[PDB]
Every structure is written in C-alpha cells, then in structure tokens.
Design a protein around this nucleic acid. Structure first.
Lengths: 73, 162, 18, 243, 138, 176
RNA sequence: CUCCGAACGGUAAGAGCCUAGCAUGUAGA
RNA sequence: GGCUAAGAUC
RNA sequence: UGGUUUCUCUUCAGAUCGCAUAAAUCUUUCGCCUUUUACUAAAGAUUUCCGUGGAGAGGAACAACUCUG
RNA sequence: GUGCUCGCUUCGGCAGCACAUAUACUAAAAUUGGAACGAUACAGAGAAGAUUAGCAUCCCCUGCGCAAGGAUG
C-alpha cells in the first residue's frame, strides 16, 4: 500500500493511501475524501501529463511517497 | 504631511449668499495640483447650483493665487497665462460673474433621449457645448500652468478688436 | 482673515434661507 | 513609578522595571547611542537625550515616541525636565544650549554662552531658578527664558558632573579629577579638593563622570572613572573662612 | 410565510389575514425585483413603501378604527407585521405622516439636520420637486 | 470579445450572465476550436443556425477539458442574453430535438423559478432519443424525457448548478 | 496503541510577433 | 578614511 | 420619601471583577535543529480581544401601579 | 399633515392658533485610455582564469512582521 500525497498548490496537500493494483478511479475517490471536492472534477497532473481514468497505479510505477500535483477541472 | 484649515477660494465660487455651509474631509480626494491629499471642502453655492468641492491642493494653490474650484485668479479673474502676460488685469476683469461657473453638469440621459428622471432631474437637460472650439479642450496643467491655455489665448486676442 | 462666531447654526441657517 | 529606566549606548533605552527585575518596555527609535535620560515629574514621558542627531520624547507605558525635538547641531548630551520650566532644557554639544517646548518641539530660546561643548546641566529648585554649566567658561541661568546671573570660577577642565543641593552646595565633577565644590550663591570654591585613584588604575585616570547627592542630602555620591564609586560624607568644621 | 411563533394567535387575526397577506406578497415581489431601472438607492424605495403601508394598516386598526384587540395587536408587533418604533413615532403629534424612520435620525445627515421628508411644502422653497433619497418620498 | 456580448441589457440571478457556469469550465471553453470559430461573430439568427447543425448533448470529455458544442452554444447564448420570447421560441420549436434541449438549458439556468416549472413540464411528454457524449468520449443514447427529468432532478448536469427557489411540493402550497 | 505538519531555500537566462479580466468619474467655455 | 586575525600572505 | 424598564457616555476596578479562559509581546529555560517563520511547555510580567461590576448625565414605554419605610 | 378656536359660524367650508425647517462624493450616466513572462516558431546555461575577504558612515518587490530575503551609490 503506497501513500500517495496529493499535494496541490495553496495549502491543499493530503495523504491518500491506495493499493498498488488499485485503479486511478479509486484513487480520485480517496483523494476527494480528504480534500472536499467532487471526484469527477479532479484532474491529476505531473508536468502537463493528465492521467487517464482507467489505468491502474501499478502501471505508472507510482511508489510510496510519489507526490502528485492535483488540479481541478 | 498636507493639512489645511480654510479654503482659499474666490467670491464667485463661494456662493451668492452671505451664509453657506462647508464640509471638510481631511487628507482625501487626491488633489492633482500637487499629487497630495488635501482638505476637500465641499459646499453649496445656492439653489440649483453644482455643489462642487475643492480640487487643487492647499500649498500648490498658494503660489498661483487662484480660486480653489475655478482656479482662474484672485482679484481680476483672468487665467494664469493671461495673468503672467502683463493695468492689464484691470481691463480684462469682469465683475458680476455668470452662473455657468456654479451650474451643474448635463444629463447624459437627456442627450441620449431617455431622460427617465423627469422634472426632478438635478442635471441640466440642455444642449452641450460645441466640441470644435478650443474652450472645451483644456486639461489639468493646461489651466494651472500658462502653457497651452486656450482661455488666455482668446483673452489677449479679443482685447484688440475695435 | 478668518473670524468665527459663537452663534447658533439653526437660527442662522433659518434666517438666511427665509 | 517603580521603574528603574536605563539608557545604553547600543541604541536601546532599556526600561528595566524593578517590579520583576527585568526588561518590561525595551523602547527604541534612536539611531545611535543615548547620552542621558531624565524622567519628567509631571508629564508621563521620558526625555531620552540621544546622540545621533537629537533627543527623543518617549512616552512611558506606551512604547512610542511623542515628538522629535530636533534643535541641536550636534549630540544632545545633557537633558533637563523641570515642572517649572515649560520647555525641556536640552544640552547640546554644539556650544549652544536650547529650550525645546514639550507641545510644539521647537527651541524657544538659545543660550548666548558656553563657548565650549556644553555637556553638563544642573537645577537648584530650593530657593532659586535652575542653573546650567559648561566645561570652559560656565555660567548660571534662569528658568523663565534664561537670564545670565554670573559666570563660574577658574575651572577649565572638562566638566561632566554638575550637582547642586538644597543647602546651597554646588559640586562640579570634572574629568581631570579636580572635584571643585563651590556655592550656588557666593560662587567661591569652598573645598576644591582632588580625589585619589585606584591602585590597579593608571596615574591619570581618575575623573568624576557622574555625581549626585543622596535622598537625605547627607552623604555625597560621586562615581569616578577609576572603577570605584566613592562616597563623601560631611564633617563639621569652622576654620574655612574665605576672603 | 412562517409565523415563527406557533403559539395559536387569537381572534381577529383571521379578519386581518388576507389583507396582511396581500401586503406581504407585494413586498416579496418587490424584493425579487432586479436592480435595473433604479439608479443607486431607488431600489430600496419600494422596500420602505411596502413597509410604510404595512405599519399604517395595523396603526389604523388599533388607534383610528380601534377594531383589533390588544392581544392581536401585541401578536402582530411581535411576529413582524409592523415595527414598534414606527408606531411610536406616529403617536407624537409632531410626526403623523413621516416617510421613514431613517429620515428622523439626527446623526444620518452630514450637516447634522433632518431630511426633506420631514419638512412641509409651505415652509419650503417655491421651486422644488425633490424627493428624499434615504427615506423615499416626502 | 469574451466578456459580454451585451453592454448593459440584463443580469443573471446572482452574478454576471457569463459567470453562470463554473470558472474551471468557462476558462477551458473560452479557448477552444469550436468556440474561436463562433465567438468572432454570433447573432440571434446566427444562434439558430449553429444550434440546428449540431446533434450532441453533453459537457466536457477527455483528459483535458474539451467542451461539447452544446455547452459552447449555451455559453454563447448566455453571453448574448436574448429576450424571453426568443428563448420560448427555441423551446417550442420542433425543428430539431437538440434545439429544444438547447433552450431548456438556458431556461433552467437563467429563468425564474415559476417559469422553469412552466416551460419544462410540456417537455416531459417527449419520447424521442438523443446522443450524449460520455466521460470517456463515447456516445450514449438518452431520451428527451430522460434529459428533461435530469434538469428537474438534483444539480448534477454537465457543468451546471442552479437550484430553484423551492421544490415541487413547496411551490404546490403557494401556486399550481 | 491511533501525536495527522505547512511555506521559503525550486523551475531560470532572451530575441521577433500575437491577443486579453483590469481603472479614473473633475474645474473650464 | 576607521575597525577586523604584524590581516592571513611567495 | 414617591419610577419598573431600555439605549447612549464618565470614572475606579484588587471581589473565583471570569464558579470558565484565548492570542501576541518582553526577560530567562528545554527538545529538535539545516536558512527563517509557522514550532514543545516551565517561570514571571506587559498589551489586545470575548465580557462584567457601583455612580452621577440625556431619550422611549401606564409612570403612575402607588414599591419599601 | 395632525389636534384645537366660546372665530366667520355653517356644521358643506373658510381663517387663525400649536408641532413638524433644508437628505442628496447628487444619475438608470457620457466617455477616456491598456497591463499576463501567457501560447506558438527561432538558438539553447558554455566543451576554459593570477587580487586574499567584511563591517556602518541612498530605495522597489515577496512576506503579517519590532524575524527575514533579492537589488543597490
């Protein structure tokens, strides 16, 4: 279980623990549970690389502590 | 900084009555004569007047010796370009001033036709001036300083007519 | 030259407007 | 008020209150060292005679300055806050004493004396007005607008301490160690004795930098420059008639 | 609208039920009016005008006609049908047709006086069709 | 060009008429290929031309926020702010199924509470179908009564949030 | 045994062209 | 022209 | 002797003025320390804020119900 | 407008008495002038240095600063 820290700008930085084989759609539901927004309106980004909605976390090699820059759509 | 106690204004801008009422706002209104806040002294010249206030600064108007609102002169009434030209101020002066110096602004809804205010409109629902003349094309420093003064230009030109 | 007065503002504004 | 205010040379008027034996205010505002501080008996303010370019009227228990009494061409060494004098008598080192008012701040009257750098001032409110002082060619003064009564005796050394008691004694503490004691009324030097020095100190190092009488006006206290706070008591005698 | 008391209002409230409901529906429709047309403070003018007519209906039923009971009068002033300060100013003989309670405040004017609403036309100037900006009318 | 197509005509219920959709959705829709070809010129008669050509009902799709032309024509209609007769004309016209759906979005966003229940109630009897762009970009079939009931449902439309003044039960106690 | 941290120390550096959400409310004739 | 460790200095 | 209330403004508060209890600053202490602010809490005294207490001044409501004596 | 005159004196009204005495940076305005270090295309931080250092004797920006930091003569 990796602890992905969705640390966006302006104070919004939360920890999101997800499974390795868990999909990215399950990660946005856990990231919205600590941030306070709709999970359908959250777009994760890492230098203009907008992630998909169907690719598992084990495919991106997102290890523990690999922080993400959260953005809102 | 920049404080004041009484406005150095003319008798024309002071109102056509012995009794008036002043309203002092200390360190405000952003007086562009010296780019410093001055005591904005608002008053009422009379019935159906403009009810203007102070525009120039306090110390900036002391060297020019003009009105606080009209900003023409102290005794004669000619502009600063006409006062620095030249007695010359005795002939160019004119007592019993017109009410256009204390007249209110024009109604923009009356110029557009949709004057929905009616007879209770405080603005003047009359025809505006002719924009082809240089008398309605002055500026801030153009009236204070003598450079580019259209009112002082016609005052020296119309003085030699007959 | 300023010269204040200790008269009432109510009677002065009523007499001048009348 | 129970507050032993102190003026340090590190540009900090550390008002060490004696209610807890610690700093309570730590007021600031001076650009350089502070020469002297005097508490006003009536107005709740402290006249901090700084040495940057002027003095400072610091308000007690407010931690803020009241007005900058800039009326000196040099460092304002001496300071005097009298209830009788409406102004604040500031002693400037530019050979010109001044009396800056408390409300306005400008110097109401200068001093046409004290050709040397005036760094001393006194006050005798017992039966006369407040006097003044100078290192070279000192003279008396008056509290209403100044009045030169008489000059001083032959004391040419750099005077730094000038105390006056209510019994008519006038003590002058100079930097040369010649503690000349004269009279505030007669003017002749009564004792004019010179003090000794510490054995660990040098030969020419003893100098009275500060001197003030006791609260009971019995034993005089003069702090010398030889690291020895000397106390001078009184003694009864009659064979000291001056001609 | 909710009565906000739930305390069984007495007799005479049903006699004044549709009259106060028509005045309350007029003020709610005036509150839903947009900011177009009004210049700067003309939008607050029907807010005081509906409030002035609501206070005049209760005061005429209590003082002039004297048909409403005092128990229904105290329940109407507590529920918000009419302001108690507006009925207090109308009890004095010096003010019986005042425009608004804001115009009677002495500290509201910059010159420290009353407004043009509390001034008769015979004692005023000849040519004046002015209206009170704070109150709403004369 | 993008502030407001009218200088001073009317206003929205709580803000500017252009600031009715979300600011995250309005910023991405302001820079689009379908928007830049349309925002250079758009009139009342030109709004009926572009709305009849498009047959799609949805909002954003894809990784980046790519707005549908249904949401793009909705923002251009809200920036233009037409009269109530033109908005009632687009809802009653049977020339296209997407034309009545485009008028219903402008009715539920900027219209009054009594006017929203009065206009959307005859739209519930339509049994026709339409194509809707999903979140993954694929098309999905949606009935006309299914989209009209979704506008009267909770605020979950594609980039739209505007509650009514009351519910259907609270409005029933006051009016019909 | 369940005490959960946030920012700065960080993306450079520049050349030509292109488009924008902003603000003031004047005396004068 | 002042204070800094003949300021350290082949 | 003669007034239940309510709102404005003028002092001192050494009474758990507060039957409960926040933040900042100053002078000393500990832990981390890597530049700093955000830090941990032990002691003491200086403000700000949430509030309050007696005693004169001015308006409104029945001040008239007649309260104590 | 509100209440009253041993008023004219009808009770339709008129005249007088008493109270109420100056709100409004005045408009639903008229115009006036433009700023992303923002995208796109071009080349891509040198593949190379012999004075040995600081302290005080004039201002913009980040920041809430009686902490702090960049630029300065």
């Amino acid at each position: 279980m990796i602890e992905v820290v969705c640390n966006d700008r302006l104070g919004k930085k939360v920890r999101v623990k997800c499974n390795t084989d868990d999909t990215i759609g399950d990660l946005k539901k856990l990231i919205a549970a600590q941030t306070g927004t709709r999970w359908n309106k959250i777009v994760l980004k890492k230098w203009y690389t907008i992630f998909k909605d169907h690719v598992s976390l084990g495919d991106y090699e997102i290890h523990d502590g690999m922080n993400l820059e959260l953005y809102y759509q | 900084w920049e404080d004041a106690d009484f406005p150095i204004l003319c008798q024309t801008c002071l109102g056509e009555n012995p009794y008036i009422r002043m309203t002092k706002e200390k360190y405000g209104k952003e007086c562009k004569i010296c780019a410093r806040p001055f005591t904005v002294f608002r008053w009422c010249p009379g019935v159906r007047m403009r009810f203007k206030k102070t525009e120039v600064c306090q110390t900036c108007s002391k060297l020019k010796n003009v009105c606080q609102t009209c900003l023409l002169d102290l005794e004669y009434g000619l502009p600063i370009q006409v006062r620095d030209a030249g007695d010359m101020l005795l002939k160019l002066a004119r007592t019993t001033p017109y009410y256009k110096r204390n007249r209110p602004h024009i109604c923009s809804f009356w110029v557009k036709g949709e004057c929905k205010r009616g007879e209770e409109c405080p603005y003047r629902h009359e025809k505006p001036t002719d924009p082809d003349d240089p008398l309605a094309d002055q500026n801030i420093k153009d009236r204070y300083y003598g450079i580019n003064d259209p009112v002082a230009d016609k005052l020296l030109k119309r003085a030699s007519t007959m | 030259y300023a010269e204040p007065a200790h008269i009432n503002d109510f009677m002065f504004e009523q007499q001048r407007r009348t | 008020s129970p507050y032993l205010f102190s003026c340090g040379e590190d540009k900090q008027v550390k008002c060490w209150d004696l209610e807890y034996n610690k700093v309570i205010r730590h007021y600031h505002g001076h650009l350089s060292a502070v020469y002297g501080l005097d508490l006003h008996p009536t107005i709740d303010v402290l006249v901090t005679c700084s040495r940057d370019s002027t003095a400072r009227i610091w308000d007690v228990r407010t931690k803020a300055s009241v007005h900058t009494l800039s009326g000196h061409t040099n460092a304002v060494a001496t300071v005097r806050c009298q209830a009788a004098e409406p102004q604040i008598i500031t002693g400037s080192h530019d050979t010109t004493i001044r009396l800056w008012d408390l409300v306005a701040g400008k110097t109401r009257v200068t001093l046409t004396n004290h050709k040397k750098s005036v760094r001393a001032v006194v006050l005798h409110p017992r039966h006369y007005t407040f006097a003044s002082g100078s290192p070279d060619n000192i003279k008396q003064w008056k509290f209403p607008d100044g009045s030169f009564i008489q000059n001083l005796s032959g004391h040419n050394a750099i005077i730094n301490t000038l105390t006056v008691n209510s019994d008519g004694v006038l003590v002058s503490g100079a930097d040369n160690g010649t503690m000349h004691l004269w009279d505030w009324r007669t003017g002749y030097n009564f004792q004019r004795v010179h003090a000794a020095v510490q054995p660990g100190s040098l030969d020419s190092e003893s100098g009275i930098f500060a001197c003030a009488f006791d609260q009971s006006e019995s034993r005089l206290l003069t702090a010398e420059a030889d690291k020895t706070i000397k106390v001078y008591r009184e003694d009864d005698t009659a064979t000291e008639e001056t001609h | 609208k909710v009565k906000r008391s739930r305390k069984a209002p007495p007799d005479g409230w049903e006699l004044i039920e549709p009259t106060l409901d028509e005045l309350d529906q007029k003020m709610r429709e005036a509150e839903t009016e947009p900011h177009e047309g009004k210049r700067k403070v003309e939008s607050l003018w029907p807010i005081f005008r509906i409030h002035h007519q609501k206070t005049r209906y209760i005061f005429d039923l209590f003082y002039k006609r004297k048909a409403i009971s005092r128990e229904l009068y105290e329940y109407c002033i507590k529920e918000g049908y009419a302001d108690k300060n507006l009925i207090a100013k109308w009890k004095k003989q010096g003010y019986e047709n005042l425009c608004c309670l804001r115009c009677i405040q002495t500290r509201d004017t910059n010159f420290g006086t009353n407004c043009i609403c509390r001034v008769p036309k015979s004692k005023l100037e000849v040519g004046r069709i002015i209206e009170c900006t704070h109150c709403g009318c004369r | 060009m993008a502030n407001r197509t009218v200088k001073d005509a009317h206003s929205i219920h709580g803000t500017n008429p252009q600031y009715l959709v979300e600011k995250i959705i309005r910023t991405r829709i302001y820079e689009s290929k379908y928007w830049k070809e349309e925002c250079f010129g758009l009139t009342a008669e030109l709004v009926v031309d572009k709305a009849m050509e498009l047959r799609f009902v949805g909002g954003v799709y894809g990784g980046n926020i790519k707005p549908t032309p249904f949401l793009c024509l909705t923002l251009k209609m809200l920036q233009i702010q037409p009269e109530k007769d033109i908005i009632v004309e687009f809802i009653k016209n049977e020339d296209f199924k997407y034309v009545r759906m485009l008028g219903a979005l402008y009715m539920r966003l900027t219209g009054t509470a009594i006017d929203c229940y009065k206009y959307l109630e005859p739209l519930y009897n339509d049994y026709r179908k339409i194509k809707s762009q999903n979140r993954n970009g694929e098309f999905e079939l949606m009935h006309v009564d299914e989209f009209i009931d979704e506008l009267l449902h909770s605020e979950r439309v594609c980039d739209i949030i505007l509650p009514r003044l009351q519910k259907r039960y609270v409005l029933e106690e006051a009016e019909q």
